[PDB]
Curated annotation (Swiss-Prot):
Tissues with expression: Expressed in myeloma and epidermoid carcinoma cell lines.
This protein's name: PH-interacting protein
Chain's role: Probable regulator of the insulin and insulin-like growth factor signaling pathways. Stimulates cell proliferation through regulation of cyclin transcription and has an anti-apoptotic activity through AKT1 phosphorylation and activation. Plays a role in the regulation of cell morphology and cytoskeletal organization.
Occurrences of domain Bromo (ranges): 2-107
Lineage: Eukaryota, Metazoa, Chordata, Craniata, Vertebrata
Disorder noted: Chung-Jansen syndrome: An autosomal dominant disorder characterized by developmental delay, intellectual disability, autistic features, anxiety, hypotonia, obesity, and dysmorphic features.
Native source organism of the sequence: Homo sapiens (Human)
Range covered out of full length: 1315 to 1435 of 1821
Phosphothreonine PTM sites in chain numbering: T45
Entry's localization field: Nucleus
Amino acid sequence: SYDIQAWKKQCEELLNLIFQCEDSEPFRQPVDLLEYPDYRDIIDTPMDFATVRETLEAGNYESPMELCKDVRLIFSNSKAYTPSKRSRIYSMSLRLSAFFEEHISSVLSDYKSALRFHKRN
Ligand SMILES: Cc1nc(CCNC(=O)N2CCN(C(=O)c3cccs3)CC2)sc1C
């Protein structure tokens, strides 16, 4: 299964599943800085799933590892901003993280396998 390009469509499809999850609602667009005016005091690098999809479609990811870093930043930003570990929006983050990690594991393994096959000789 040694297609070096296959990760891109696999990531498009997973982003589609994440957009159809009710748990993604708060993470679809960049945070509302009018409702959270202290948000940039806490969070240095905002990230959201629309920004991830646009960066993919622009051809500005070279690997699924770079996409995975930006998705993991959505989740670390939610954990850093939350005033409590039982909060609603943080709770949605944990379920969505578990879903994402379950699905991205094979995408990463197949990509890394394809690159090793390319350099085999
Ligand atoms: C429809 C629409 N949606 C937008 C973005 C909505 N995102 C936020 O407002 N967040 C999500 C990230 N976040 C958190 O993780 C936490 C808050 C509380 C505990 S954690 C802060 C609030 S803008 C727009 C036009």
